[PDB]
């Protein structure tokens, strides 16, 4: 078995949004207290022992 | 094979500001070859071909 990558591109899709409402949104996400936060679904410390 | 642009010459509508709404604009063109083609001799171009 063998493989070779020819061509890799990065697709993205923007929601089309009114510029007034998407700069209101920007204003309220550039602020300190409007920080985004995520969890790792399984938060883990991986320890594998022989 | 020709490609040409032809302007309006009718005085009423050649400098008019047409305001919003739908309009019907329709005009006729001539396929007479003595009437749309000039010559340097003025020979009949319907019998020339």
């Amino acid at each position: 078995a063998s493989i070779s990558f020819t061509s890799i591109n990065l697709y993205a899709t923007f929601f089309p949004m009114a510029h007034n409402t998407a700069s209101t949104l920007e204003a309220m996400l550039r602020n300190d207290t409007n920080d985004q936060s995520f969890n790792d679904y399984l938060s883990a410390a991986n320890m594998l022992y022989p | 094979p020709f490609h040409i642009q032809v302007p309006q010459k009718f005085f009423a509508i050649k400098s008019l500001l047409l305001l919003p709404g739908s309009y019907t604009y329709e005009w006729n063109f001539r396929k007479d070859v003595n009437m749309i083609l000039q010559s340097s001799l003025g020979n009949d171009l319907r019998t020339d071909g």
Binding site: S7, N9, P16 | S22
Partner: protein
């Protein structure tokens, strides 16, 4: 759609489009579709599953493009919202941009 023909030219007269929603489309076969507006259609010689009435379409995969024009001059998917920026393409056969 004529036999072996590759395009369908559809044109709708000037019409109000107030409270218009989308469109839908599917391809049928003439012999499998009965003519409604008749008490008897004597040329209907089919009796299998009628796709028209039963909703059991199966020729949705023969479309390769559709395009919309309003006013006779403005492509509706033409506010630069698509990678093919003046029509939809359903199937692309011969792909070289990875679409």
């Amino acid at each position: 759609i004529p036999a072996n023909a590759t395009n369908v030219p559809i044109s709708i007269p000037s019409r109000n489009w107030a409270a218009f929603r989308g469109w839908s489309f599917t391809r049928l076969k003439t012999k499998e579709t009965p003519s409604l507006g008749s008490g008897f259609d004597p040329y209907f010689v089919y009796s299998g599953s009628i796709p028209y009435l039963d909703g059991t379409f199966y020729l949705n995969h023969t479309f390769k493009k559709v395009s919309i024009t309003f006013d006779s001059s403005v492509s509706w998917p033409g506010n630069d919202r698509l990678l093919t920026p003046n029509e939809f393409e359903i199937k692309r056969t011969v792909d070289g941009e990875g679409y």
